[PDB]
Amino acid sequence: MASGMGVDENCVARFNELKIRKTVKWIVFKIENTKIVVEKDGKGNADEFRGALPANDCRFGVYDCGNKIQFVLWCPDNAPVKPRMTYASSKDALLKKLDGATAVALEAHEMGDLAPLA
């Protein structure tokens, strides 16, 4: 349920360690139950998340690149579209607030999430 969501400032706070230090990162938060909170965040994003994410379920991770910033959502093959809707819908509330980043999101139904992005 994306309606009436509340966002924790920690999700946005990661951007001050991100943008100021100019070290690129990827943080993964969970959007359901009308709460936005991260379950994991790591430095070494492209290499780290390939082995750090055996998620099985869908979660929402934001990863920055030089060319663009895509909000990454891997779809759950073992889960329905109902939890899936929450992420793709509420991601605007994140995007609109945290950076001037790109309004495009990355949807993965293949192994793209844990695949070699870089």
DSSP for 67-92, please give it: S-EEEEEE--TTS-HHHHHHHHHHHH
| Other residues' Cβ atoms within 10 Å of the Cβ of residue 106 | 17
User: Looking at this protein, which amino acid is placed at residue 15?
Assistant: F
Is 76 in contact with 63 (CB distance < 8 Å)?
Answer: no
**Do β-strands 26-32 and 60-64 pair in parallel, antiparallel, or remain unpaired?**
antiparallel
Residue 3 CB burial class (10 angstroms; 0-12, 13-18, ≥19): exposed
Residues 19, 91: Cα–Cα separation, whole Å: 19
Residue 96 CB burial class (10 angstroms; 0-12, 13-18, ≥19): exposed
Is 86 in contact with 1 (CB distance < 8 Å)?
Answer: yes
Is 50 in contact with 72 (CB distance < 8 Å)?
Answer: no
User: Looking at this protein, which amino acid is placed at residue 53?
Assistant: L
Of the options 1.20.210.10, 3.40.20.10, 3.30.70.20, 3.40.50.150, the CATH number for the domain spanning 1-118 = 3.40.20.10
Selection from 27, 33, 86 nearest residue 58 by Cα? 86
Annotated domain spans of the chain: 1-118
Phi and psi at 16, nearest 5°, equal -80, -25
Residue 3 DSSP label: T
The method of structure determination was NMR
Residues 72, 110: Cα–Cα separation, whole Å: 12
